[PDB]
């Protein structure tokens, strides 16, 4: 609109939480990123060098280039009627590995273990995840707890 520069509307997005501002934990610098990793961008306002625009804050992408203290990220930006490849140079201070990819990577390793174990044992196993299924028949015992009869309560109390 009237003012359309960078950092416009980032009063809360680029700030820091109430009691965790000040010094930046050093575990961020000790994480190691390879090409092909999937990372989440979360701009830290305490470091004003090498930020990413507010559109990419909270987005996720694939690392494509690794340089000294920053990495390149390929992010698909929706621009009206199409998506556009966007290559973002963002410092390792503004990113973190995505746990969704890690959860997938523990699953792909696990699927190999069950398939290897099943083939050696000699029975087939299911690898695909299955959504929640309708409940089967079950019997409920009332030997300890019996049903409690509850009825709607009167308006009674005005306050």
């Amino acid at each position: 609109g009237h003012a359309a520069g960078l950092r416009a509307g980032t009063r809360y997005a680029f700030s820091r939480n109430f009691r965790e501002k000040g010094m930046i934990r050093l575990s961020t610098y000790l994480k190691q990123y390879k090409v092909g990793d999937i990372v989440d961008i979360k701009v830290n306002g305490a470091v004003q060098k090498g930020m990413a625009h507010k559109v990419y804050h909270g987005k996720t992408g694939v690392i494509y280039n690794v340089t000294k203290s920053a990495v390149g990220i390929i992010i698909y930006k929706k621009v009206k009627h199409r998506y556009i490849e966007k290559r973002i140079n963002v410092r390792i201070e503004h990113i973190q590995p995505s746990r969704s990819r890690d959860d997938f990577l523990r699953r792909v390793k696990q699927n190999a273990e069950l398939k290897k174990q099943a083939k050696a044992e000699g029975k087939p196993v299911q690898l695909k995840r299955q959504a929640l299924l309708p409940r089967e028949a079950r019997t409920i015992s009332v030997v300890d707890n019996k049903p409690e009869t509850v009825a709607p309560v009167a308006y009674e109390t005005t306050i």
Partner: protein, 64 residues
């Protein structure tokens, strides 16, 4: 004569008429724009690997 200033009405319906398509990615992404040190070395790494495969296929090498 004043007019209507802006409108995002009908802009989402216009976009989805031909879908919002992501561009297709090939197996080998472009290495232009990567680190120059890595990029120069990768040129030599591929050149040597091609030579090694050629020698192994021809017969001068038996390690591939």
């Amino acid at each position: 004569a004043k007019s209507k200033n802006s409108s995002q009405h009908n802009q989402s319906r216009k976009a989805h008429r031909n879908g919002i398509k992501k561009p297709k990615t090939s197996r080998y992404p472009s290495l232009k724009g990567t680190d120059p040190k890595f990029r120069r070395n990768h040129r030599h790494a591929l050149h040597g690997t091609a030579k090694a495969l050629k020698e192994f296929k021809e017969g001068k090498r038996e390690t591939a």
